[PDB]
Amino acid sequence: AGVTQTPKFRILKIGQSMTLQCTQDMNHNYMYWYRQDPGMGLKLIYYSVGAGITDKGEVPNGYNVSRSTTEDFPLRLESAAPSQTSVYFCASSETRGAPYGYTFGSGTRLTVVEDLNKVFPPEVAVFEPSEAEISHTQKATLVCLATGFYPDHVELSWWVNGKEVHSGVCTDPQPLKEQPALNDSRYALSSRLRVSATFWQDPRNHFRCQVQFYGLSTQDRAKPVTQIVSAEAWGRAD
Amino acid sequence: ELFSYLIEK
Amino acid sequence: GSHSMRYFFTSVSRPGRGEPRFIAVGYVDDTQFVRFDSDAASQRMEPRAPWIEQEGPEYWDQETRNVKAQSQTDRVDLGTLRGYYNQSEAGSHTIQIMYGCDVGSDGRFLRGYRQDAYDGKDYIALNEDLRSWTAADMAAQITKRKWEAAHEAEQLRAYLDGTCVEWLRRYLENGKETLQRTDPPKTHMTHHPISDHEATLRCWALGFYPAEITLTWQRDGEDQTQDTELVETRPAGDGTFQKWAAVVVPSGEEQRYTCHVQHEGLPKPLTLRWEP
Amino acid sequence: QRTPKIQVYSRHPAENGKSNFLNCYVSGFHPSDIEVDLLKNGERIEKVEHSDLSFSKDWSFYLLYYTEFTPTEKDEYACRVNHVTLSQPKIVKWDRDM
Amino acid sequence: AQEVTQIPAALSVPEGENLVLNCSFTDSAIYNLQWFRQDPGKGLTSLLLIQSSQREQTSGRLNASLDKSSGRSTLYIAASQPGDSATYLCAVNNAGNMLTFGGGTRLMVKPHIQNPDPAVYQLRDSKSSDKSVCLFTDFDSQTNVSDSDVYITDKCVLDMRFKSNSAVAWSNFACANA
């Protein structure tokens, strides 16, 4: 339904080629490609006003597009460069004026890397609440910590007794860098789950921190592919 | 200066 | 006197031979000041009158973006209208657009207009009130609905009696030496016998500006409006205009006829008569 | 379908041996496709500029074709126009004394 | 050309308090103006769409104004709540430049903590190892947090349905410092 954008993410070597797919079945003449760097707004790369024509936008350099059909408007990267690391959004509209606004795709997070030995999956570990905290506040705060992963594209989530929870949960706005000065620093993300002292002091309760990692699709170590690395801890009345 | 409020026919 | 700014757009479909031909031209009175041609190498709005070149890079960037937008709109419309009239994809078709505004000597708004055509026939036009549209056929009535919903009239009126008038005043002031000058016509007369008992008297006016002129023939000081060959006012190529009017006269009675010339540049209307 | 009207004339008044411009003004025609040549003694002149395509209230198109020329007593100049509406290419001869 | 700007780029506001987000654009010849919501990692959500003719648009607790004279738009958020926390983008559409986006304003709507109780706690790793972390929590929404071998994260909003803030620090060193 609406604009469909593939892929959702991609890790690519400096110089390798990639083709982002964008499809819509609403028969829209107008289709657009935007990119967004962290903390900035969308910048128009290329656009098309119908089947058989394309025209350059604000930042067209290093990108190629085609429009054989009304349905499809793919974006091609001839030679990937560090500056092409960005989030790419595709859009469509019935008219130029777009009085219902543009129909936008989900987005494609692109990471350009010097080599595929600079990518790493996360190591996850859960930390049990402080006895001082429990004794002082009658509350138990579990802390989860994902460390040594790249790129920053991960999704952390707490799971209590097999079910996902949101009440009493707190995740970092963005990851922290293990060597901030370095341009290809491995990231570290933390999260907290707070429950009652009684709910923690009970061995029937199971707390799991699940961290989805979006990575690759040839070293002796494990190839950093799209994994789900977890870490868990159980309550204790002793 | 050109008219810019362009609506398709 | 009264001045005008007009833009003219021609879009011609070239099926099998790539994109449609697009020609946009801007006129102050009868002087072209801007041009865009899809087949030209520049792919820019280009100056065509000396007085527009003092406009900065912002003006040229903006008019290039807006003329390209009009081109793209015409490209879509050609495909749409082809659908409305259920025409074949093999056939070549033409969309023509003219819009502009007129101002008086004081430089205040007089009137505005826009007219659209398909294959050299009326499609849709803005009315004198600048609030409603006249649709030529059922196909144009579909366009009218889509323009009524988008409020094209309200936004076009705002241009025609606002933006249009403002930029015309600016152009007229910047191009003062050429645009607001008045050159009176250099007049003369030629004699061409068709046969016996008959001859053609032709009354000439050359090097005049602006194009507005009135050539009329008289017999014994009485206007001969009916039996007069009045040629189309033509450009000289140096920024001036040329015109002639002709009447068939029986040989001997050349002295009976006179040519009257009315023009702004003249301090007094001229009255020519044939002389050996 | 509208037939092109043709006017052939000089930019300035004709004086033999003095550099001038030869004009061919084609108006009142539709559609836009047209083939306009300027002739010296029946031969096509190569270097010929023209105005950008515009049109009148009735939608009929007009163009000015022009080239640098030095008129003489004997040299013949003409404008040759071809258009879908014309039976044959229309040649109109330059007459300075018109 | 169309240049859209959003100053300030960041705005911190306490829960319940009304706020304003600023948008300026240089080309006032427009089809419409648009306000988008963007959550971290997610796409865009259209909040309001003001036509060039229209003066304001209203959708629940959201109100947006349009002034083509100055070339400005303001987004009014009434009775702000932590759910409103996101990046807000201003977009302007016209023939020449098409839909053109501002830089964006990152809005932080901080929770009102009724009973602060600031304290730094040391937490042991679940798996049998020396690994540990320091947890500073139960501090008011006003106080903020900031060596290479020690890492300190930013504060976040923990709502246990009571509310609390928390920040974590760790090293390969005691929790007495920071």
mmCIF file of C-alpha atoms in Angstrom, chain A:
data_model
loop_
_atom_site.group_PDB
_atom_site.id
_atom_site.type_symbol
_atom_site.label_atom_id
_atom_site.label_comp_id
_atom_site.label_asym_id
_atom_site.label_seq_id
_atom_site.Cartn_x
_atom_site.Cartn_y
_atom_site.Cartn_z
ATOM 1 C CA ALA A 1 0.000 0.000 0.000
ATOM 2 C CA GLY A 2 1.266 3.517 -0.972
ATOM 3 C CA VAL A 3 5.048 3.826 -1.731
ATOM 4 C CA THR A 4 7.131 0.608 -1.158
ATOM 5 C CA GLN A 5 10.926 1.146 -0.616
ATOM 6 C CA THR A 6 13.598 -1.673 -0.709
ATOM 7 C CA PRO A 7 15.934 -2.291 0.949
ATOM 8 C CA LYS A 8 15.269 -1.127 4.586
ATOM 9 C CA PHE A 9 19.091 -0.996 5.238
ATOM 10 C CA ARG A 10 22.428 -1.937 3.524
ATOM 11 C CA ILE A 11 26.151 -2.020 4.607
ATOM 12 C CA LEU A 12 28.300 -1.342 1.453
ATOM 13 C CA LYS A 13 32.112 -1.161 0.764
ATOM 14 C CA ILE A 14 33.647 2.152 -0.553
ATOM 15 C CA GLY A 15 33.326 1.830 -4.391
ATOM 16 C CA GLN A 16 30.697 -1.012 -4.555
ATOM 17 C CA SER A 17 27.409 -0.402 -6.518
ATOM 18 C CA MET A 18 23.827 -0.471 -5.036
ATOM 19 C CA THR A 19 20.297 0.030 -6.562
ATOM 20 C CA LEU A 20 17.544 1.299 -4.146
ATOM 21 C CA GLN A 21 14.058 0.185 -5.409
ATOM 22 C CA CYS A 22 10.939 2.456 -5.121
ATOM 23 C CA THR A 23 7.449 1.297 -6.343
ATOM 24 C CA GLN A 24 3.897 2.813 -6.142
ATOM 25 C CA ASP A 25 0.657 1.405 -7.742
ATOM 26 C CA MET A 26 -1.424 4.661 -7.375
ATOM 27 C CA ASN A 27 -0.395 5.720 -10.969
ATOM 28 C CA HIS A 28 1.386 8.914 -9.681
ATOM 29 C CA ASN A 29 3.246 10.861 -12.465
ATOM 30 C CA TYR A 30 5.552 12.548 -9.850
ATOM 31 C CA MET A 31 8.211 10.528 -7.891
ATOM 32 C CA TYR A 32 11.124 11.947 -5.771
ATOM 33 C CA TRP A 33 14.345 10.784 -3.985
ATOM 34 C CA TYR A 34 15.513 12.579 -0.759
ATOM 35 C CA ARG A 35 18.462 11.915 1.639
ATOM 36 C CA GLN A 36 18.741 12.967 5.354
ATOM 37 C CA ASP A 37 22.050 13.217 7.331
ATOM 38 C CA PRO A 38 21.774 12.950 11.169
ATOM 39 C CA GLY A 39 20.167 16.096 12.738
ATOM 40 C CA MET A 40 19.371 17.661 9.283
ATOM 41 C CA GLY A 41 16.246 17.733 7.018
ATOM 42 C CA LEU A 42 15.486 15.913 3.701
ATOM 43 C CA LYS A 43 17.462 17.111 0.586
ATOM 44 C CA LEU A 44 16.009 16.387 -2.934
ATOM 45 C CA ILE A 45 18.512 14.213 -4.959
ATOM 46 C CA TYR A 46 16.509 13.491 -8.198
ATOM 47 C CA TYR A 47 12.814 13.628 -9.327
ATOM 48 C CA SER A 48 10.605 12.511 -12.293
ATOM 49 C CA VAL A 49 7.362 14.213 -13.576
ATOM 50 C CA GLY A 50 6.346 11.064 -15.578
ATOM 51 C CA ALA A 51 7.480 7.852 -17.383
ATOM 52 C CA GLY A 52 10.482 8.588 -19.695
ATOM 53 C CA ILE A 53 11.974 11.748 -18.002
ATOM 54 C CA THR A 54 14.189 12.488 -14.921
ATOM 55 C CA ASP A 55 15.635 15.874 -13.707
ATOM 56 C CA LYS A 56 18.427 16.725 -11.157
ATOM 57 C CA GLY A 57 17.448 18.050 -7.667
ATOM 58 C CA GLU A 58 19.582 19.949 -5.064
ATOM 59 C CA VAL A 59 22.320 17.235 -4.520
ATOM 60 C CA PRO A 60 22.329 14.951 -7.628
ATOM 61 C CA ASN A 61 26.158 14.308 -7.695
ATOM 62 C CA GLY A 62 27.214 10.609 -7.326
ATOM 63 C CA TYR A 63 23.652 9.255 -8.008
ATOM 64 C CA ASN A 64 21.804 7.871 -11.114
ATOM 65 C CA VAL A 65 17.993 7.372 -11.631
ATOM 66 C CA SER A 66 15.635 5.976 -14.365
ATOM 67 C CA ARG A 67 11.820 6.038 -15.037
ATOM 68 C CA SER A 68 10.926 3.415 -17.739
ATOM 69 C CA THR A 69 7.460 2.898 -16.084
ATOM 70 C CA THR A 70 5.083 5.093 -13.957
ATOM 71 C CA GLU A 71 5.275 2.410 -11.167
ATOM 72 C CA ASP A 72 9.088 2.209 -10.573
ATOM 73 C CA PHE A 73 11.792 4.904 -9.958
ATOM 74 C CA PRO A 74 15.039 3.158 -8.837
ATOM 75 C CA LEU A 75 18.074 5.109 -7.415
ATOM 76 C CA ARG A 76 21.551 3.694 -8.373
ATOM 77 C CA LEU A 77 24.926 4.426 -6.615
ATOM 78 C CA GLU A 78 27.779 3.953 -9.199
ATOM 79 C CA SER A 79 30.666 4.292 -6.629
ATOM 80 C CA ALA A 80 29.838 4.573 -2.857
ATOM 81 C CA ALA A 81 31.795 7.277 -0.885
ATOM 82 C CA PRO A 82 31.905 8.109 2.884
ATOM 83 C CA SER A 83 29.628 11.204 2.294
ATOM 84 C CA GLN A 84 26.878 8.906 0.788
ATOM 85 C CA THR A 85 26.317 7.389 4.317
ATOM 86 C CA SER A 86 22.726 8.693 4.968
ATOM 87 C CA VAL A 87 18.980 7.766 5.300
ATOM 88 C CA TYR A 88 17.285 7.777 1.813
ATOM 89 C CA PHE A 89 13.499 8.514 1.493
ATOM 90 C CA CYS A 90 11.411 7.944 -1.706
ATOM 91 C CA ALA A 91 8.143 9.915 -2.330
ATOM 92 C CA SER A 92 5.288 10.194 -4.929
ATOM 93 C CA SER A 93 2.324 12.585 -5.642
ATOM 94 C CA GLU A 94 -0.673 12.795 -8.082
ATOM 95 C CA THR A 95 0.013 16.537 -8.872
ATOM 96 C CA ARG A 96 3.053 18.904 -8.473
ATOM 97 C CA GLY A 97 0.964 21.014 -6.001
ATOM 98 C CA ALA A 98 0.320 17.843 -3.884
ATOM 99 C CA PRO A 99 -2.744 19.219 -1.996
ATOM 100 C CA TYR A 100 -2.840 15.986 0.173
ATOM 101 C CA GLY A 101 0.988 16.202 0.657
ATOM 102 C CA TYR A 102 3.554 13.650 -0.690
ATOM 103 C CA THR A 103 3.237 9.849 -0.117
ATOM 104 C CA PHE A 104 6.620 8.854 1.497
ATOM 105 C CA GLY A 105 8.381 5.441 1.778
ATOM 106 C CA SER A 106 9.597 3.843 5.083
ATOM 107 C CA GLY A 107 13.271 4.834 4.419
ATOM 108 C CA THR A 108 16.626 3.143 3.513
ATOM 109 C CA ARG A 109 19.540 3.525 6.039
ATOM 110 C CA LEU A 110 22.817 3.299 3.983
ATOM 111 C CA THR A 111 26.237 2.777 5.731
ATOM 112 C CA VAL A 112 29.448 3.161 3.585
ATOM 113 C CA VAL A 113 32.528 1.402 5.164
ATOM 114 C CA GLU A 114 36.275 1.217 4.193
ATOM 115 C CA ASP A 115 36.163 -2.625 4.691
ATOM 116 C CA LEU A 116 33.708 -5.305 6.047
ATOM 117 C CA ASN A 117 36.156 -5.904 9.001
ATOM 118 C CA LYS A 118 34.971 -2.511 10.480
ATOM 119 C CA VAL A 119 31.431 -4.011 11.108
ATOM 120 C CA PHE A 120 30.772 -5.887 14.441
ATOM 121 C CA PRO A 121 27.647 -7.314 16.187
ATOM 122 C CA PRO A 122 26.741 -6.231 19.774
ATOM 123 C CA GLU A 123 27.709 -7.985 23.079
ATOM 124 C CA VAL A 124 24.656 -7.746 25.460
ATOM 125 C CA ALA A 125 24.746 -8.159 29.308
ATOM 126 C CA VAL A 126 22.032 -7.528 32.011
ATOM 127 C CA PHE A 127 23.047 -6.012 35.432
ATOM 128 C CA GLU A 128 21.063 -6.999 38.607
ATOM 129 C CA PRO A 129 19.620 -4.226 40.864
ATOM 130 C CA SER A 130 21.625 -2.745 43.831
ATOM 131 C CA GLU A 131 20.578 -4.151 47.289
ATOM 132 C CA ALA A 132 21.070 -0.553 48.643
ATOM 133 C CA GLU A 133 18.527 0.713 45.999
ATOM 134 C CA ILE A 134 15.942 -2.014 46.974
ATOM 135 C CA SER A 135 16.453 -1.275 50.748
ATOM 136 C CA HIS A 136 16.245 2.562 50.196
ATOM 137 C CA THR A 137 13.423 3.049 47.580
ATOM 138 C CA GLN A 138 11.645 -0.410 47.675
ATOM 139 C CA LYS A 139 12.263 -0.477 43.848
ATOM 140 C CA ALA A 140 14.496 -2.712 41.616
ATOM 141 C CA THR A 141 16.182 -1.173 38.481
ATOM 142 C CA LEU A 142 17.708 -3.673 35.957
ATOM 143 C CA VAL A 143 20.309 -2.122 33.538
ATOM 144 C CA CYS A 144 21.004 -3.640 30.046
ATOM 145 C CA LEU A 145 24.218 -2.704 28.103
ATOM 146 C CA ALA A 146 25.004 -3.452 24.392
ATOM 147 C CA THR A 147 28.728 -2.752 23.573
ATOM 148 C CA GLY A 148 31.181 -2.977 20.605
ATOM 149 C CA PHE A 149 28.786 -2.856 17.576
ATOM 150 C CA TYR A 150 28.814 -0.919 14.229
ATOM 151 C CA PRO A 151 26.883 0.657 12.678
ATOM 152 C CA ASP A 152 24.627 2.363 15.335
ATOM 153 C CA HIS A 153 21.494 0.779 13.650
ATOM 154 C CA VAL A 154 20.154 -1.544 16.461
ATOM 155 C CA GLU A 155 16.774 -2.013 18.304
ATOM 156 C CA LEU A 156 16.781 -2.832 22.093
ATOM 157 C CA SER A 157 13.639 -4.242 23.877
ATOM 158 C CA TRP A 158 12.944 -5.717 27.392
ATOM 159 C CA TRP A 159 11.004 -9.066 27.687
ATOM 160 C CA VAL A 160 9.481 -10.081 31.112
ATOM 161 C CA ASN A 161 8.226 -13.745 31.342
ATOM 162 C CA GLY A 162 8.297 -14.165 27.502
ATOM 163 C CA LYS A 163 6.231 -10.946 26.877
ATOM 164 C CA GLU A 164 7.604 -7.497 25.762
ATOM 165 C CA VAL A 165 7.130 -4.616 28.317
ATOM 166 C CA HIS A 166 7.244 -0.760 27.926
ATOM 167 C CA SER A 167 6.009 0.479 31.393
ATOM 168 C CA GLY A 168 9.095 1.138 33.622
ATOM 169 C CA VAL A 169 11.498 1.029 30.576
ATOM 170 C CA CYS A 170 14.141 3.681 29.572
ATOM 171 C CA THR A 171 16.561 3.468 26.545
ATOM 172 C CA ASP A 172 19.312 5.992 25.513
ATOM 173 C CA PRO A 173 18.214 8.511 22.805
ATOM 174 C CA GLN A 174 21.300 7.436 20.717
ATOM 175 C CA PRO A 175 24.369 5.169 21.262
ATOM 176 C CA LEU A 176 27.701 6.397 22.817
ATOM 177 C CA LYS A 177 31.071 5.965 20.958
ATOM 178 C CA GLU A 178 33.827 3.701 22.488
ATOM 179 C CA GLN A 179 36.534 5.910 20.797
ATOM 180 C CA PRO A 180 34.610 9.167 20.071
ATOM 181 C CA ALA A 181 37.545 10.899 18.221
ATOM 182 C CA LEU A 182 37.856 7.947 15.723
ATOM 183 C CA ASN A 183 35.688 8.260 12.527
ATOM 184 C CA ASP A 184 34.703 4.496 12.519
ATOM 185 C CA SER A 185 34.107 4.104 16.330
ATOM 186 C CA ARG A 186 32.205 1.007 17.631
ATOM 187 C CA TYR A 187 29.018 2.136 19.509
ATOM 188 C CA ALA A 188 27.587 1.329 23.007
ATOM 189 C CA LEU A 189 23.825 1.566 23.927
ATOM 190 C CA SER A 190 22.289 1.127 27.459
ATOM 191 C CA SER A 191 18.684 0.658 28.789
ATOM 192 C CA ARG A 192 16.912 0.389 32.225
ATOM 193 C CA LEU A 193 13.863 -1.684 33.387
ATOM 194 C CA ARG A 194 12.415 -0.625 36.814
ATOM 195 C CA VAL A 195 10.026 -2.971 38.766
ATOM 196 C CA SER A 196 8.872 -3.211 42.457
ATOM 197 C CA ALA A 197 11.268 -4.762 45.074
ATOM 198 C CA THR A 198 8.633 -7.579 45.513
ATOM 199 C CA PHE A 199 8.513 -8.348 41.707
ATOM 200 C CA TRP A 200 12.372 -8.695 41.593
ATOM 201 C CA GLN A 201 12.584 -10.674 44.924
ATOM 202 C CA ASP A 202 10.654 -13.666 43.397
ATOM 203 C CA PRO A 203 12.415 -16.491 41.449
ATOM 204 C CA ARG A 204 9.351 -17.120 39.135
ATOM 205 C CA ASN A 205 10.080 -13.827 37.200
ATOM 206 C CA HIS A 206 12.422 -13.905 34.103
ATOM 207 C CA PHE A 207 13.895 -10.601 32.679
ATOM 208 C CA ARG A 208 15.461 -10.640 29.133
ATOM 209 C CA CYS A 209 17.129 -7.746 27.170
ATOM 210 C CA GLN A 210 16.803 -8.416 23.366
ATOM 211 C CA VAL A 211 18.966 -6.256 20.964
ATOM 212 C CA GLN A 212 18.132 -6.639 17.202
ATOM 213 C CA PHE A 213 21.248 -5.815 15.042
ATOM 214 C CA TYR A 214 20.961 -4.775 11.319
ATOM 215 C CA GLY A 215 24.304 -5.652 9.597
ATOM 216 C CA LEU A 216 25.608 -7.755 6.634
ATOM 217 C CA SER A 217 23.831 -10.410 4.431
ATOM 218 C CA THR A 218 35.522 -13.790 5.138
ATOM 219 C CA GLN A 219 37.595 -14.052 8.404
ATOM 220 C CA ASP A 220 37.902 -16.980 10.926
ATOM 221 C CA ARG A 221 35.543 -15.086 13.366
ATOM 222 C CA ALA A 222 31.687 -15.024 12.984
ATOM 223 C CA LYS A 223 30.522 -12.948 9.923
ATOM 224 C CA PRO A 224 28.639 -9.852 11.261
ATOM 225 C CA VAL A 225 25.142 -10.623 9.751
ATOM 226 C CA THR A 226 21.632 -9.391 10.847
ATOM 227 C CA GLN A 227 21.397 -11.132 14.302
ATOM 228 C CA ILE A 228 19.316 -10.894 17.555
ATOM 229 C CA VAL A 229 21.836 -10.972 20.504
ATOM 230 C CA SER A 230 20.075 -11.431 23.926
ATOM 231 C CA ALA A 231 21.000 -11.467 27.679
ATOM 232 C CA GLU A 232 18.722 -12.555 30.606
ATOM 233 C CA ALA A 233 18.515 -12.645 34.462
ATOM 234 C CA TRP A 234 16.005 -14.243 36.948
ATOM 235 C CA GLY A 235 14.534 -12.844 40.223
ATOM 236 C CA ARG A 236 15.811 -14.223 43.590
ATOM 237 C CA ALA A 237 14.231 -14.371 47.119
ATOM 238 C CA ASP A 238 17.204 -16.640 48.193
#
